[PDB]
Amino acid sequence: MRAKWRKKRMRRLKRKRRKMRQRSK
Amino acid sequence: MQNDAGEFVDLYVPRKCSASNRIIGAKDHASIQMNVAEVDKVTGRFNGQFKTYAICGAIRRMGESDDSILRLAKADGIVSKNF
Amino acid sequence: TKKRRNNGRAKKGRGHVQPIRCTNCARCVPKDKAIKKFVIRNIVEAAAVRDISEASVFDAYVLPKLYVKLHYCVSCAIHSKVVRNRSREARKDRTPPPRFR
Amino acid sequence: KEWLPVTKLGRLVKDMKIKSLEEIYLFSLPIKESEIIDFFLGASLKDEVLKIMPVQKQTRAGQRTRFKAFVAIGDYNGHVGLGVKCSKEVATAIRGAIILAKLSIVPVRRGYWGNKIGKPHTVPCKVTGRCGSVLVRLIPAPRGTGIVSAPVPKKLLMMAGIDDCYTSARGCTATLGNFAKATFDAISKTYSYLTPDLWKETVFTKSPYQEFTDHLVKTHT
Amino acid sequence: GRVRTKTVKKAARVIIEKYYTRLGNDFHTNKRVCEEIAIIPSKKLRNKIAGYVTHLMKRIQRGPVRGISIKLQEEERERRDNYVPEVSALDQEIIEVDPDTKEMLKLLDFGSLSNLQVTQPTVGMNFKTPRG
Amino acid sequence: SGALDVLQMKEEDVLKFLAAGTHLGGTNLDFQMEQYIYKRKSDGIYIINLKRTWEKLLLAARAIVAIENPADVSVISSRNTGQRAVLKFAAATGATPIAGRFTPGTFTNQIQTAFREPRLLVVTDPRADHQPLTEASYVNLPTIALCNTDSPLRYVDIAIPCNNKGAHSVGLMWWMLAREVLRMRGTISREHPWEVMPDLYFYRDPEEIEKEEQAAA
Amino acid sequence: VRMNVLADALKSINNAEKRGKRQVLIRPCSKVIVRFLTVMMKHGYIGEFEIIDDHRAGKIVVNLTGRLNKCGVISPRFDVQLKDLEKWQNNLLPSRQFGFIVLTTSAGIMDHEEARRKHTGGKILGFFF
RNA sequence: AGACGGACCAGAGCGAAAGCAUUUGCCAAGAAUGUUUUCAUUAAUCAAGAACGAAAGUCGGAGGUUCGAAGACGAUCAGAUACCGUCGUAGUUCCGACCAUAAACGAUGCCGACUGGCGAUGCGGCGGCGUUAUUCCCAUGACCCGCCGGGCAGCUUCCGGGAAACCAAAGUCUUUGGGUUCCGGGGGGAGUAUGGUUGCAAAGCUGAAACUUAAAGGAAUUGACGGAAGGGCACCACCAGGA
RNA sequence: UCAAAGUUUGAGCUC
Ligand SMILES: [Mg+2]
Ligand SMILES: [Mg+2]
Ligand SMILES: [Mg+2]
Ligand SMILES: [Mg+2]
Ligand SMILES: [Mg+2]
Ligand SMILES: [Mg+2]
Ligand SMILES: [Mg+2]
Ligand SMILES: [Mg+2]
Ligand SMILES: [Mg+2]
Ligand SMILES: [Mg+2]
Ligand SMILES: [Mg+2]
Ligand SMILES: [Mg+2]
Ligand SMILES: [Mg+2]
Ligand SMILES: [Mg+2]
Ligand SMILES: [Mg+2]
Ligand SMILES: [Mg+2]
Ligand SMILES: [Mg+2]
Ligand SMILES: [Zn+2]
């Protein structure tokens, strides 16, 4: 994975983590 | 070099350029000994005595040596002070 | 390692320049890096004028000219074979050859 | 066996007139012929093969291995030499290295630490030397301390006869060649160091070519 | 292709350089010269040597060669250098001199000279080579 | 040489210098060659003071005389301009010439056939003879050299200012050196002129050569 | 801004002595510098310099000889006890035989050996050898 | 109707930096120069704090010519949801609101000194035969030959340094200290997590650990390869053809 | 005045 996807993929990841934590709140 | 007793200890005292006052090394292959013929003033023939001027290699390869020499001659009255 | 001193361009005091669209491509090249060619040329070059000169009415009537100024992009230039590769040493020789060609 | 010499220096030496190679170092003359040194010091001289190092450049046919010899030579007073030769086989490689070292032998300047009574034993001052990456500072030491250094520097400075000397090192000593070239420049610049001793103006003795110009011309063309 | 080897060529230069006079242009005669004076074991070697020796003799007979010192050329150089004209070109009845060398000699001791002429100044300042 | 009217320059010789155009230097000027320049002209050529040229010449006399055994002088010129000169000088002085194509590594490579080990050198032009200079660092050689204003003073120890560009001033400077070496020792009297003509030292062009052979025929 | 006059001057001379230059012009004339030169001069390391008085900070012209390997400075001016003098002069010099460390004192500007005779510690200025 | 002001356009200029080029007018500023102008230490660098800060992105209007993310279809292709094409949305334009990120590169912090040349150039200033317009002189303009200050760059060398590539600076270093900020200490894990703060959002900023692992990289040499170029050869290559 | 050209036993290379 080129840094293009490392950085962009971590962005898609951060959206997923924020939602998963919100349902638990 | 000597101690209190006065003994010269080094086996060979090296030459020192006359122009820079820099001691010429054991492997300075750009070094020199210019021997200058002395002249019988009236006659214009060789007396017998020479006039040595030693130069370091460094100033030679920098290129200001021929001026330095001209200065030595003109200082020692070899070249005209009028010039 | 540093391949060239000027980075294939002429940006020493300035800072930015306007981009151009390639003719053969449309590749965007900085005008200052971009290759500039002022080609003026006869609408009829040499072989044609001898043929076309037959087609003219008047004996020796001068032809107007075709005042172009071309810019190409790099990969096109090597493909169109305007410029050749040079050696590391010859690279600094930035004088163009005389006017034999 | 018989060295019939060609050069000007060679023929004056051969006739047994020029008594020491210090007389030549005074005038910075290139010591091309090895038989002069074998004439003068051949007895007390001692050799040490430092290492055999196999470099190999790749070919279509494997790679051509060829060995590179390091050779320390030197009598324990004053003089030392350093020969380096690369060749395909050891006998010629070592011989030619030994000749090149003998050609290159230089004197070491030695003075007194502290109290001047007695004979000079250590280094005069804090001398340094380098080659490539490696830097090696030599330091003055008092009598009887010994050579505080690595086996290698220790091993040479003995051969030159420098009993007491502290050392400091820096960089990639692993490049051995560089370590030897740098400690060699160190001990070379000892006779090139300008002490107040030498403020005394030099007496310019007559050059051996001047004294013997008619001899070499009469002996040969 | 009938091309000469270095053993062919060096032999021909040695033959013409050592015995230019004995040698000549025709192969079959100067062959007799080459076989007599030089013992060539093979006839092919003999004949090749002779044929390049011949054509080379014609080259020298045509003219002087660049990268070789002929003794004859040494004699002609001694002859040419001893060639002297009637008078030297330096001896001149009048010598032209610029105003600076006039002013400098007049400040020096050498003020008045018989055959001098302080010539006119070079008017029209165009000495620099064009830029670009 | 200093403070001595005997060895000083003559009215004929001054006319000879000016006739060659020795005073007439080049267009470009190195910052080291300032001492020898007098002044600038209109048209931009620097005029060399010929008395100090003279003085350097007398220094040459002293040096050549100081070399006791004359064999160990070496005299080089690669270009033809000083080719007849170095020969004529070797003829008169008894020196060992090097005429064209100075084989590199002659002074360093022992096994090489032409290994000469002289004690003094005289070059006609530094740029063309850079290879001698690079050897002249490896061997302890002093050096005389004819140098123009452009000439660079790397490794040169006694440059002589002349119009080394011109043919006449060059051959002439060589003739004067051969004279002065002879006059400064017990050989010649200053009453007579030297028989030899400076055009004996000169360079002749092949057209002038065809002109001579044609005039002969 | 220009802080240390001496610090500029001593570099200028060391970049002269490396090139074997013959005489050197230094642009700001300070009294401490002047004392420094007179110290080296009485002891014979250089010739006779001369100072160009302008109703201003003067200039100074040193006719240089060739015996000076280096002439250095120590900024900041450290205090030096007699305890530390040996460690300083050890680590700061080529040898135990020659070379000097010059420090100005209440007593006055003088060499370290003279400080050893007089029993006087003080503020290190610089050194030379 | 709205973009855009070609060619003139340079190894040229100015700007703190991004960058800045249709005409004319208004407003104020400034580097640099000449100066026997006034004051007489008023200065340099800086955590905290602050102004500006290309493109994309965002919110409102205004405007919506071209191109053109997205998207559709038509083509090649084993597959192409791409490279090719026809359309074509947001955006691209202006005003007003946010934002503070680029290889934001000279990948080179600011002041201060010293040590080699060489020619060219831009500005201000000075000096100096003569040409050439003002025409009818002066004093200006265009040339011309120089000197001075600093300025964008260039070339140059055994200055010396540097692992080398290279640098009159990347110099003045074991002969190590002119002044002062920032910042790095094996690779990965990871600019992630957790916490804090800002923002409408996009995201920015500060910023760990576990665990794993003996190597990761730079410059330069010789090969080998090249759907990169230049040279040269061969009917087991081609060309011309034949079984 | 540029559509394309992918792989290769696990069964042993080397100072
Ligand atoms: Mg327009
Ligand atoms: Mg930008
Ligand atoms: Mg801060
Ligand atoms: Mg924007
Ligand atoms: Mg925007
Ligand atoms: Mg919005
Ligand atoms: Mg489109
Ligand atoms: Mg489809
Ligand atoms: Mg499309
Ligand atoms: Mg950035
Ligand atoms: Mg440091
Ligand atoms: Mg780490
Ligand atoms: Mg492992
Ligand atoms: Mg086959
Ligand atoms: Mg064919
Ligand atoms: Mg493809
Ligand atoms: Mg397999
Ligand atoms: Zn292109």
Numbering used by the authors:
A (entry chain n): 1 to 25
B (entry chain VV): 1 to 83
C (entry chain aa): 2 to 102
D (entry chain CC): 58 to 278
E (entry chain RR): 2 to 133
F (entry chain AA): 2 to 218
G (entry chain WW): 2 to 130
What sentences appear in the manuscript?
Blasticidin S (BlaS) targets translation by binding to the peptidyl transferase center of the large ribosomal subunit. BlaS is a peptidyl-nucleoside antibiotic composed of a cytosine, a pyranose sugar ring, and an N-methyl-guanidine tail. All three structures have BlaS bound in the 60S peptidyl transferase center.
The A-site in the small subunit (the decoding center) is bound by eRF1, and eRF1 and eRF3a are in the pre-accommodation state. In the eRF-Bound termination complex, eRF1 is bound in the pre-accommodated state and complexed with eRF3a. The lower local resolution of the eRFs (4.5-6.0Å) and the flexibility of the P-site tRNA (only weak density for the 3′CCA tail and anticodon stem loop is detected) suggests that these factors are in a state of conformational sampling, likely a product of attempted accommodation of eRF1. However, density for eRF1 was found only in the decoding center of 40S in one of the structures. This eRF-bound structure, which presents ∼6% of the particles, is lower resolution (4.1 Å) compared to the other two structures, and the local resolution of eRF1 and eRF3a is even lower (ca 4.5–6.0 Å), suggestive of a degree of dynamic conformational sampling within the eRF1–eRF3a complex. However, small differences are found in the positioning of BlaS’ cytosine and N-methyl-guanidine tail resulting in a slightly altered hydrogen bonding network and clearer base stacking with both C75 and A76 of the 3′CCA tail.
